[PDB]
Design a protein around this motif. Structure first.
Motif, PDB file in Angstrom:
ATOM      1  N   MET A 227      -7.919  10.724  -0.969  1.00  0.00           N
ATOM      2  CA  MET A 227      -8.014   9.291  -1.231  1.00  0.00           C
ATOM      3  C   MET A 227      -6.881   8.840  -2.154  1.00  0.00           C
ATOM      4  O   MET A 227      -6.609   9.475  -3.174  1.00  0.00           O
ATOM      5  CB  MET A 227      -9.379   8.941  -1.846  1.00  0.00           C
ATOM      6  CG  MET A 227      -9.478   7.527  -2.434  1.00  0.00           C
ATOM      7  SD  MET A 227     -11.182   6.913  -2.602  1.00  0.00           S
ATOM      8  CE  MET A 227     -11.916   8.183  -3.631  1.00  0.00           C
ATOM      9  N   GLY A 228      -6.220   7.746  -1.787  1.00  0.00           N
ATOM     10  CA  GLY A 228      -5.140   7.199  -2.601  1.00  0.00           C
ATOM     11  C   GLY A 228      -5.685   6.559  -3.863  1.00  0.00           C
ATOM     12  O   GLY A 228      -6.426   5.579  -3.795  1.00  0.00           O
TER      13      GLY A 228
ATOM     14  N   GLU B 242      -6.502   1.696   4.486  1.00  0.00           N
ATOM     15  CA  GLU B 242      -6.921   3.093   4.573  1.00  0.00           C
ATOM     16  C   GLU B 242      -7.086   3.680   3.168  1.00  0.00           C
ATOM     17  O   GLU B 242      -6.103   3.893   2.454  1.00  0.00           O
ATOM     18  CB  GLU B 242      -5.876   3.886   5.363  1.00  0.00           C
ATOM     19  CG  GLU B 242      -6.194   5.354   5.553  1.00  0.00           C
ATOM     20  CD  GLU B 242      -5.053   6.096   6.221  1.00  0.00           C
ATOM     21  OE1 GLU B 242      -4.732   7.217   5.786  1.00  0.00           O
ATOM     22  OE2 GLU B 242      -4.469   5.548   7.180  1.00  0.00           O
ATOM     23  N   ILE B 243      -8.328   3.942   2.766  1.00  0.00           N
ATOM     24  CA  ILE B 243      -8.639   4.419   1.417  1.00  0.00           C
ATOM     25  C   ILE B 243      -8.792   5.942   1.323  1.00  0.00           C
ATOM     26  O   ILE B 243      -8.227   6.590   0.445  1.00  0.00           O
ATOM     27  CB  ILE B 243      -9.945   3.764   0.904  1.00  0.00           C
ATOM     28  CG1 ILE B 243      -9.818   2.237   0.885  1.00  0.00           C
ATOM     29  CG2 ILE B 243     -10.312   4.285  -0.472  1.00  0.00           C
ATOM     30  CD1 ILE B 243      -8.788   1.713  -0.102  1.00  0.00           C
ATOM     31  N   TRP B 244      -9.589   6.505   2.227  1.00  0.00           N
ATOM     32  CA  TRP B 244      -9.977   7.911   2.118  1.00  0.00           C
ATOM     33  C   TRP B 244      -9.921   8.618   3.468  1.00  0.00           C
ATOM     34  O   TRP B 244     -10.595   8.213   4.421  1.00  0.00           O
ATOM     35  CB  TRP B 244     -11.401   8.005   1.552  1.00  0.00           C
ATOM     36  CG  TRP B 244     -11.741   9.310   0.863  1.00  0.00           C
ATOM     37  CD1 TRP B 244     -11.108  10.514   1.010  1.00  0.00           C
ATOM     38  CD2 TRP B 244     -12.818   9.533  -0.059  1.00  0.00           C
ATOM     39  NE1 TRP B 244     -11.714  11.467   0.217  1.00  0.00           N
ATOM     40  CE2 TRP B 244     -12.769  10.891  -0.441  1.00  0.00           C
ATOM     41  CE3 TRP B 244     -13.814   8.713  -0.605  1.00  0.00           C
ATOM     42  CZ2 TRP B 244     -13.677  11.447  -1.345  1.00  0.00           C
ATOM     43  CZ3 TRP B 244     -14.716   9.268  -1.504  1.00  0.00           C
ATOM     44  CH2 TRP B 244     -14.644  10.621  -1.861  1.00  0.00           C
ATOM     45  N   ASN B 245      -9.121   9.679   3.543  1.00  0.00           N
ATOM     46  CA  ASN B 245      -9.060  10.517   4.740  1.00  0.00           C
ATOM     47  C   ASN B 245      -9.841  11.812   4.527  1.00  0.00           C
ATOM     48  O   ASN B 245      -9.642  12.512   3.530  1.00  0.00           O
ATOM     49  CB  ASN B 245      -7.607  10.833   5.106  1.00  0.00           C
ATOM     50  CG  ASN B 245      -7.475  11.468   6.485  1.00  0.00           C
ATOM     51  OD1 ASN B 245      -8.394  11.406   7.300  1.00  0.00           O
ATOM     52  ND2 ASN B 245      -6.324  12.085   6.749  1.00  0.00           N
TER      53      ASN B 245
ATOM     54  N   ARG C 223       0.777  -1.240   0.000  1.00  0.00           N
ATOM     55  CA  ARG C 223       0.000   0.000   0.000  1.00  0.00           C
ATOM     56  C   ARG C 223       0.813   1.297   0.000  1.00  0.00           C
ATOM     57  O   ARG C 223       0.242   2.374  -0.159  1.00  0.00           O
ATOM     58  CB  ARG C 223      -0.976   0.005   1.184  1.00  0.00           C
ATOM     59  CG  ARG C 223      -0.316   0.180   2.544  1.00  0.00           C
ATOM     60  CD  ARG C 223      -1.347   0.088   3.663  1.00  0.00           C
ATOM     61  NE  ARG C 223      -0.810   0.434   4.979  1.00  0.00           N
ATOM     62  CZ  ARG C 223      -0.261  -0.438   5.822  1.00  0.00           C
ATOM     63  NH1 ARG C 223      -0.149  -1.717   5.487  1.00  0.00           N
ATOM     64  NH2 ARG C 223       0.188  -0.029   6.999  1.00  0.00           N
ATOM     65  N   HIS C 224       2.129   1.200   0.181  1.00  0.00           N
ATOM     66  CA  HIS C 224       2.976   2.396   0.294  1.00  0.00           C
ATOM     67  C   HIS C 224       3.812   2.676  -0.950  1.00  0.00           C
ATOM     68  O   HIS C 224       4.490   1.783  -1.460  1.00  0.00           O
ATOM     69  CB  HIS C 224       3.926   2.279   1.488  1.00  0.00           C
ATOM     70  CG  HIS C 224       3.254   2.389   2.819  1.00  0.00           C
ATOM     71  ND1 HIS C 224       2.997   1.294   3.615  1.00  0.00           N
ATOM     72  CD2 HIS C 224       2.800   3.466   3.502  1.00  0.00           C
ATOM     73  CE1 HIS C 224       2.413   1.691   4.731  1.00  0.00           C
ATOM     74  NE2 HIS C 224       2.279   3.005   4.687  1.00  0.00           N
ATOM     75  N   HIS C 225       3.778   3.928  -1.407  1.00  0.00           N
ATOM     76  CA  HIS C 225       4.641   4.400  -2.486  1.00  0.00           C
ATOM     77  C   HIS C 225       5.433   5.629  -2.049  1.00  0.00           C
ATOM     78  O   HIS C 225       5.110   6.258  -1.037  1.00  0.00           O
ATOM     79  CB  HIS C 225       3.811   4.790  -3.712  1.00  0.00           C
ATOM     80  CG  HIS C 225       2.899   3.710  -4.198  1.00  0.00           C
ATOM     81  ND1 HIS C 225       3.347   2.445  -4.519  1.00  0.00           N
ATOM     82  CD2 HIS C 225       1.566   3.710  -4.440  1.00  0.00           C
ATOM     83  CE1 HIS C 225       2.326   1.709  -4.924  1.00  0.00           C
ATOM     84  NE2 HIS C 225       1.236   2.454  -4.891  1.00  0.00           N
ATOM     85  N   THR C 226       6.460   5.981  -2.822  1.00  0.00           N
ATOM     86  CA  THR C 226       7.058   7.310  -2.704  1.00  0.00           C
ATOM     87  C   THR C 226       6.184   8.291  -3.485  1.00  0.00           C
ATOM     88  O   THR C 226       5.690   9.272  -2.930  1.00  0.00           O
ATOM     89  CB  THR C 226       8.520   7.372  -3.222  1.00  0.00           C
ATOM     90  OG1 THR C 226       8.595   6.818  -4.542  1.00  0.00           O
ATOM     91  CG2 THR C 226       9.456   6.608  -2.291  1.00  0.00           C
ATOM     92  N   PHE C 227       5.977   7.998  -4.767  1.00  0.00           N
ATOM     93  CA  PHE C 227       5.112   8.806  -5.625  1.00  0.00           C
ATOM     94  C   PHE C 227       3.722   8.177  -5.699  1.00  0.00           C
ATOM     95  O   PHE C 227       3.587   6.976  -5.935  1.00  0.00           O
ATOM     96  CB  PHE C 227       5.708   8.911  -7.032  1.00  0.00           C
ATOM     97  CG  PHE C 227       4.815   9.594  -8.032  1.00  0.00           C
ATOM     98  CD1 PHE C 227       5.049  10.910  -8.404  1.00  0.00           C
ATOM     99  CD2 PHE C 227       3.748   8.918  -8.613  1.00  0.00           C
ATOM    100  CE1 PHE C 227       4.232  11.544  -9.333  1.00  0.00           C
ATOM    101  CE2 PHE C 227       2.924   9.546  -9.537  1.00  0.00           C
ATOM    102  CZ  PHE C 227       3.168  10.861  -9.900  1.00  0.00           C
ATOM    103  N   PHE C 228       2.691   8.990  -5.505  1.00  0.00           N
ATOM    104  CA  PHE C 228       1.321   8.518  -5.682  1.00  0.00           C
ATOM    105  C   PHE C 228       0.384   9.679  -5.976  1.00  0.00           C
ATOM    106  O   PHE C 228       0.737  10.842  -5.775  1.00  0.00           O
ATOM    107  CB  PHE C 228       0.841   7.725  -4.455  1.00  0.00           C
ATOM    108  CG  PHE C 228       0.681   8.558  -3.212  1.00  0.00           C
ATOM    109  CD1 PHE C 228      -0.579   8.965  -2.794  1.00  0.00           C
ATOM    110  CD2 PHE C 228       1.785   8.925  -2.458  1.00  0.00           C
ATOM    111  CE1 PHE C 228      -0.734   9.731  -1.649  1.00  0.00           C
ATOM    112  CE2 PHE C 228       1.639   9.695  -1.309  1.00  0.00           C
ATOM    113  CZ  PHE C 228       0.379  10.101  -0.907  1.00  0.00           C
ATOM    114  N   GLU C 229      -0.811   9.359  -6.457  1.00  0.00           N
ATOM    115  CA  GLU C 229      -1.818  10.380  -6.707  1.00  0.00           C
ATOM    116  C   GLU C 229      -2.862  10.376  -5.611  1.00  0.00           C
ATOM    117  O   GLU C 229      -3.351   9.322  -5.200  1.00  0.00           O
ATOM    118  CB  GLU C 229      -2.486  10.183  -8.066  1.00  0.00           C
ATOM    119  CG  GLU C 229      -1.628  10.639  -9.232  1.00  0.00           C
ATOM    120  CD  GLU C 229      -2.301  10.390 -10.560  1.00  0.00           C
ATOM    121  OE1 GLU C 229      -3.112  11.242 -10.988  1.00  0.00           O
ATOM    122  OE2 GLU C 229      -2.016   9.340 -11.175  1.00  0.00           O
ATOM    123  N   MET C 230      -3.200  11.574  -5.153  1.00  0.00           N
ATOM    124  CA  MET C 230      -4.156  11.751  -4.085  1.00  0.00           C
ATOM    125  C   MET C 230      -5.392  12.450  -4.645  1.00  0.00           C
ATOM    126  O   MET C 230      -5.314  13.582  -5.133  1.00  0.00           O
ATOM    127  CB  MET C 230      -3.518  12.562  -2.956  1.00  0.00           C
ATOM    128  CG  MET C 230      -4.365  12.687  -1.708  1.00  0.00           C
ATOM    129  SD  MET C 230      -3.548  13.655  -0.419  1.00  0.00           S
ATOM    130  CE  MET C 230      -2.134  12.640  -0.021  1.00  0.00           C
TER     131      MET C 230
END
Ligand code: G5A
Length: 441
Positions: free
Chosen positions: A238-239, A209-212, A85-92
């Motif tokens: 949200m990731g 964890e999908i959406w904060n 579930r963890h990246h350095t780069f991701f879209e939020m």
């Protein structure tokens, strides 16, 4: 199922249909925020709006923001390759309310998009929510307005061991907009290890964890004091990769269409055949952060932003070495990356050649010492007594071979060996003292 591109667009379409101004992703590099290393959240470019210093012609907005979490307040570099579930780069994916609507409507928008037969249509029974322990309002909303069974509503306090240090209080950084938040989790099922949030096994990849949804209330000061924002506001996040996994019926972020294609390209250029080796996932992640950072203006160096970039590139090259890459490979992944990023890669596509050359040069430069340094490290580990590499050796790899200490630690971690960080720092300080003595006044 929907592609990552289709999911990105559908999110924006939903909020646009709900009156939200669609705003383009900001760069990964701020021009006007000295407190911020790299963009780590969709809300970053609206920081001054939340502070009430910047006015927009719209009071509600939606974005798909490119983020890098590899330093500063939120840093997931060491998680990459170790979780699904963890990246350095991701879209939020985010929606924002600037003194527009508040708690109830924020929660309703999110629940509607996630669970409506008209939209994402996720099974409601697999969704769990967390609230800040003192946020009785959020609890009531989930329980009575939405109708989540109480057994799937979890109150989380200051679980990180200090006032406001909590998974349910979100902070941009040591300073800046912050507030209590409520999070939506998805249960991937009993084929994955892990327990629900609040539980001993919460850190597993089962309940993701999908959406904060952040209820922005304060501006945090350097001293740690909280000053109220002029207008209570909403920052949601949200990731994209995480929700894509859910929607495409897979469990790992790396199993979504985007990463499946990218990992194939990594295997191709490295000559690896085992598509399950964790190094393929690490490299796939690292090309995203490295290429986009360069597209947004970062150049490799030995200081500040440039050094974070340099560190990630070199760690990626190291992983390529472990897979048996016989020639310069990392820059060859820019093309494939552009091909899977859709409209979100437009800034990278625009600068493809430049980004490729920067990565090529950096890899070639590091190749001058990589294998020789690895040979030395192997030599030292072979005769090492105990579970910890001495600081002097770590420092020698740094000073002679250009190995950042975290790159050395990464290699050692794969063999269940630690690095004496205190020793490394002592060695660095000793050298600084020598420099001061020689340079004089
Ligand atoms: N402003 C409010 C906020 O930022 N909130 S949040 O900090 O919680 O990040 C928002 C979401 O982005 C996803 N996410 C966060 N970090 C990562 C990461 N390193 N890799 C992949 N996905 C991530 C995850 O889905 C998370 O819930």
């Amino acid at each position: 199922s929907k592609s990552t591109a289709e999911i990105r667009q559908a999110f924006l379409d939903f909020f646009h249909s709900k009156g939200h101004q669609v705003v383009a992703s900001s760069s990964l590099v701020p021009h006007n925020d000295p407190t911020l290393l790299f963009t780590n959240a969709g809300m970053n470019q609206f920081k001054d709006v939340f502070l009430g210093l910047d006015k927009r012609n719209y009071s509600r907005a939606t974005t798909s923001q490119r983020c890098v979490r590899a330093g500063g307040k939120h840093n997931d570099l060491e998680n990459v390759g170790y979780t699904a579930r963890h990246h350095t780069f991701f879209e939020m994916l985010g929606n924002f309310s600037f003194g527009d609507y508040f708690k109830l409507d924020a929660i309703l928008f999110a629940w509607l998009l996630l669970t409506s037969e008209k939209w994402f249509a996720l099974p409601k029974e697999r969704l769990w929510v967390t609230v800040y322990e003192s946020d009785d309002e959020a609890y009531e909303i989930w329980e009575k307005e939405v109708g989540i069974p109480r057994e799937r509503i979890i109150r989380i306090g200051d679980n990180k061991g200090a006032p406001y240090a909590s998974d349910n209080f979100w902070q941009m950084g040591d300073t800046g907009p912050c507030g209590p938040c409520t999070e939506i989790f998805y249960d991937h099922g009993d084929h994955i290890w892990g327990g629900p949030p609040g539980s001993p096994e919460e850190d597993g990849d089962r309940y993701i964890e999908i959406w904060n949804i952040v209820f922005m209330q304060f501006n945090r000061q350097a001293d740690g004091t909280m000053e109220p924002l002029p207008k209570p506001s909403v920052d949601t996040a949200m990731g994209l990769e995480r929700i894509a996994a859910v929607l495409q019926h897979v469990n790992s972020n790396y199993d979504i269409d985007l990463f499946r294609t990218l990992i194939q390209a990594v295997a191709k250029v490295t000559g690896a055949t085992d598509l399950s080796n964790k190094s393929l996932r690490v490299i796939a992640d690292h090309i995203r952060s490295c290429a986009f950072l360069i597209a947004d203006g970062v150049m490799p160096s030995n200081e500040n932003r440039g050094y974070v970039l340099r560190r990630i590139i070199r760690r990626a090259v190291r992983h390529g070495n472990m897979l048996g890459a016989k020639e310069t490979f990392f820059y060859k992944l820019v093309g494939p990356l552009i091909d899977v990023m859709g409209s979100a890669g437009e800034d990278l596509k625009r600068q493809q050649a430049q980004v490729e050359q920067v990565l090529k040069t950096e890899e070639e430069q590091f190749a001058r010492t990589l294998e020789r340094g690895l040979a030395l490290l192997d030599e030292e580990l072979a005769k090492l007594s105990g579970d910890t590499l001495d600081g002097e050796t770590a420092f020698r790899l740094y000073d002679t071979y250009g190995f950042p200490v975290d790159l050395t630690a990464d290699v050692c971690r794969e063999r269940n060996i630690k690095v004496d960080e205190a020793g490394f720092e002592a060695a660095m300080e000793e050298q600084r003292r020598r420099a001061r003595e020689a340079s004089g006044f």
